Amino acid sequence: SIEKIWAREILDSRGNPTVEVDLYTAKGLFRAAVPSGASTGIYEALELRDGDKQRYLGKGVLKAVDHINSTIAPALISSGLSVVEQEKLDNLMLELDGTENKSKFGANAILGVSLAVCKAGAAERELPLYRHIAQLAGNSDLILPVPAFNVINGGSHAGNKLAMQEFMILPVGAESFRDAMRLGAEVYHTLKGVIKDKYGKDATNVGDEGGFAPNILENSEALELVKEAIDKAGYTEKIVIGMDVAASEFYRDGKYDLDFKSPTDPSRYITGDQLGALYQDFVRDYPVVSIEDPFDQDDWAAWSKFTANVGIQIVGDDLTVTNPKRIERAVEEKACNCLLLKVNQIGSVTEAIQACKLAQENGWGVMVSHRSGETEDTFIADLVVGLCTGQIKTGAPCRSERLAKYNQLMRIEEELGDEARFAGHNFRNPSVL
Amino acid sequence: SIEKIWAREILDSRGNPTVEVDLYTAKGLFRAAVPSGASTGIYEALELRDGDKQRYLGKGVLKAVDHINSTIAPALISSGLSVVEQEKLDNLMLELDGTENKSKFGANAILGVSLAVCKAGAAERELPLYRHIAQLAGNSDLILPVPAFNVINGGSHAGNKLAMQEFMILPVGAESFRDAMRLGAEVYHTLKGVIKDKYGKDATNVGDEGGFAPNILENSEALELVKEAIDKAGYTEKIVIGMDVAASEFYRDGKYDLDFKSPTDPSRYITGDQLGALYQDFVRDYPVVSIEDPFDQDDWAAWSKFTANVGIQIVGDDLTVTNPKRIERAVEEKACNCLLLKVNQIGSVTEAIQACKLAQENGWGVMVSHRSGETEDTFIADLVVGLCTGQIKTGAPCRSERLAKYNQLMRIEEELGDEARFAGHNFRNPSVL
Ligand SMILES: O=C[C@@H](OP(=O)(O)O)C(=O)O
Ligand SMILES: C[C@@H](OP(=O)(O)O)C(=O)O
Ligand SMILES: [Mg+2]
Ligand SMILES: [Mg+2]
Ligand SMILES: [Mg+2]
Ligand SMILES: [Mg+2]
């Protein structure tokens, strides 16, 4: 049923090129765009950039766009497949690319088309996108997720010394998704005033994901500021904390650097055991219920040891790269107990859905995620509701590449009406609701 | 006619509630959202907020949403007017409100519906939105504007001592709108590095509009950084500078305070004459081609004297508030020569089109503008092309409430094909194309 495919370069939320795809059927135009990370795992599917150093500092995506327009488009048009056939269309692309890591076309070329196909397929079925994704995944009973808002940005997403990437608030005690937005926004605005009072107005500019970027160094101080703002806002009993350490970003010679944005000094490196003990303190002193990428993507022993010794959610991101092969190993080694789901780590909607179901079948949580370079696309709002995962991270409640998803989640909750169920304290396993 | 209107509260780009409207006709669903300013002029149409200090810090828009759903929607549906009848539908809302400044329903209520009507009207006409806007305005040409990107900020809501609000770059020498985006993005990334080298990583997080706020007091230092970045990027021949001083934010006792964020000391206040002489130095020393709000919104004498003594573009924003009554005065007094067009300073599409036509009929330029609180809505991209104004300011090339509009302008340039014309060096007077 595909009539025409046309891709172009747009700019993402950091001002870098990315791929957008228009796909036409008899039902109209369906448009999707692809996100892009900065703290990208070494095992992610290849993001194809042009490397023309004069043009966009080598970050153009004209090669991927030309792959879609000149090669992928006719191939899918020639297949005569309906756009409801997500798996057959995705398989066609994966086979035409022919490499393990989508390095011929780029994962960004293939994903852009895969997302546009899924939106077209929804229209073909006369279904909202979240319901079409539920059907693809084999789910019936949809769930609005707890949002995890990154309200202090550090690591590779902000100009400060703060090494850990993300400090998030999860309004598990909210009444609804729309009430979760109010809780998160109120804590965020209260947090601004906490930071301004303590560190001055000049500490309240934001990092790449909209979280404030105060020029602090201690990760316990970020946790302190977040706990203060939750309490000041009146929500101690309703809002808990999650972290994405992104420890691969500061992994240095078998050790870890908590001042990695400062000129090098190997004497400050701590070991993985020292790092884990610091996490145990955070878990004891603050309401931390989830830690993502606490150790490097290859540091398997540290992950399996930490996971065995805590009762909280431990999330694979650069460890697992939304990749069934790496997920199978993490399940076997009990490396973690939740998968961060990033469609662009693996490069297709079908593979991402496969990765989600593999985690869920092994009793893991799944947290759908944005990338730090996002667009105005809102696909992952419909994806998290259709996959019924119960949790999504897609930014602070600041910068509309983040709010576009949160706003779409409010619209979905509205659409579902009395059938809406919010994951609340069952964010790790919302199936019980 | 209109089948259904439904409003809701969504979050804008700073995490504050704003109005979104869904409007249904036999052609389907049309959705629009309303932006919000921070440096708002005293003559703007009223933005209605709920003022419940316990909910969203007083900034809810439940009252505006209720005026739409309980009052405006049934009245417009009762009318039977076709959504092509922009002027009659807007007049109906204006009459039901009955106040000069839209303070019964809120300019935010009325505008939300006005924008959604306009989108549905384009679909009724089987036209893209930019062409429907051009027909509403009586234009049969279409022009892609030069974008003005806000890259360094100061002003009343930034934590540096820098008094002036915005320093913008304009790629007037670009080959196309898509090429303007590349020039803007490359210079913005170059500036980040220039700031990092001079002020430290800690100075490179971003403000509400995606620009940087290093800790500087001297406005000339902002200009110097921007000029260094343009030069370092290789684009000295193709990029010029615009400023938004927002002088109403620092007017004090009949004078002006360029260190207004340090504790009050009237001994440092300068006259409007002193401030005008400073602008003359900027224009001599830097490629400044446009200054917006160089004096207070009531300091008519300074505006007329300055505009008579320079050749640059002088933009009314808080002076004119997209308001035909104020614009008539400014034309008669020769207070300025360009109008900044903000649909939500006046509150309806019809009135904003009348404001643009009044400026253009009197020989002024018009620069379409975002607000500092934006959403994923991209109406103003179609608006600037349909009104053929040649200039738009809608953010740094960072944060997707800004890039949504720039990306949409790239899409329109693509849609126009061989017929696309870029205002380039004719941005002040594009009608010569
Ligand atoms: O918050 C998103 C991520 O950042 P990115 O990898 O897209 O830079 C992450 O590491 O989880
Ligand atoms: C960009 C805009 O800021 P605000 O929307 O805060 O008035 C302006 O003053 O021109
Ligand atoms: Mg990462
Ligand atoms: Mg991560
Ligand atoms: Mg203003
Ligand atoms: Mg202004």
Short mmCIF file of N, CA, C and O and ligand atoms in Angstrom, two decimals, chain B residues 37-40 165-166 209 244 292 317 340 342 369-372 393, ligand 2:
data_model
loop_
_atom_site.label_atom_id
_atom_site.label_comp_id
_atom_site.label_asym_id
_atom_site.label_seq_id
_atom_site.Cartn_x
_atom_site.Cartn_y
_atom_site.Cartn_z
N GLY B 37 4.42 34.89 26.89
CA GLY B 37 5.65 35.63 27.13
C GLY B 37 6.08 35.72 28.57
O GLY B 37 5.27 35.49 29.52
N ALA B 38 7.31 36.17 28.76
CA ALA B 38 7.88 36.52 30.12
C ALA B 38 8.09 38.05 30.16
O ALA B 38 7.55 38.71 31.11
N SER B 39 8.81 38.62 29.14
CA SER B 39 8.96 40.10 29.12
C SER B 39 7.72 40.64 28.36
O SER B 39 7.75 41.04 27.14
N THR B 40 6.58 40.67 29.04
CA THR B 40 5.33 41.09 28.36
C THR B 40 5.09 42.59 28.53
O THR B 40 5.22 43.17 29.65
N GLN B 165 18.21 42.08 26.29
CA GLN B 165 17.58 40.76 26.28
C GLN B 165 18.17 39.76 25.30
O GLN B 165 18.41 38.59 25.66
N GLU B 166 18.32 40.13 24.03
CA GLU B 166 18.65 39.11 23.04
C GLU B 166 19.65 39.67 22.04
O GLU B 166 19.52 40.81 21.58
N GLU B 209 15.21 30.35 25.43
CA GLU B 209 15.07 30.32 23.97
C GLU B 209 16.22 29.58 23.30
O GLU B 209 16.33 29.67 22.05
N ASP B 244 17.43 42.48 20.58
CA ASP B 244 16.17 42.90 21.21
C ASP B 244 16.59 43.41 22.59
O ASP B 244 17.03 42.65 23.48
N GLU B 292 15.42 46.09 18.33
CA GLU B 292 14.02 46.03 18.76
C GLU B 292 13.92 46.56 20.21
O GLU B 292 14.80 46.33 21.07
N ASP B 317 8.00 46.22 19.61
CA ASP B 317 7.46 44.95 20.13
C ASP B 317 6.54 45.39 21.26
O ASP B 317 5.36 45.47 21.02
N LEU B 340 7.08 43.96 15.25
CA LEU B 340 7.27 42.56 15.64
C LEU B 340 5.83 42.02 15.76
O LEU B 340 4.98 42.55 16.52
N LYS B 342 3.28 39.38 16.99
CA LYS B 342 2.97 38.31 17.96
C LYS B 342 1.49 38.12 18.04
O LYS B 342 0.77 38.97 18.62
N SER B 369 7.22 36.70 15.23
CA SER B 369 8.01 36.32 16.41
C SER B 369 7.27 35.26 17.24
O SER B 369 6.02 35.24 17.34
N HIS B 370 8.11 34.35 17.77
CA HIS B 370 7.70 33.48 18.88
C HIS B 370 7.48 34.24 20.17
O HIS B 370 7.71 35.48 20.24
N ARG B 371 7.05 33.51 21.23
CA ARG B 371 7.22 34.00 22.60
C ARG B 371 8.29 33.21 23.33
O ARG B 371 8.65 32.12 22.86
N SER B 372 8.80 33.70 24.46
CA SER B 372 9.86 32.95 25.20
C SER B 372 9.31 31.61 25.79
O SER B 372 10.08 30.65 25.98
N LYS B 393 11.82 35.73 13.97
CA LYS B 393 12.67 35.33 15.09
C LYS B 393 11.89 34.26 15.84
O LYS B 393 10.74 34.49 16.27
C1 LIG C 2 11.07 36.86 22.48
C2 LIG C 2 10.15 37.82 23.30
O1 LIG C 2 10.24 37.39 24.76
P1 LIG C 2 8.80 37.35 25.54
O2 LIG C 2 7.94 36.38 24.78
O3 LIG C 2 9.26 36.91 26.91
O4 LIG C 2 8.20 38.74 25.44
C3 LIG C 2 10.38 39.33 23.03
O5 LIG C 2 10.40 40.17 23.99
O6 LIG C 2 10.47 39.78 21.88
#
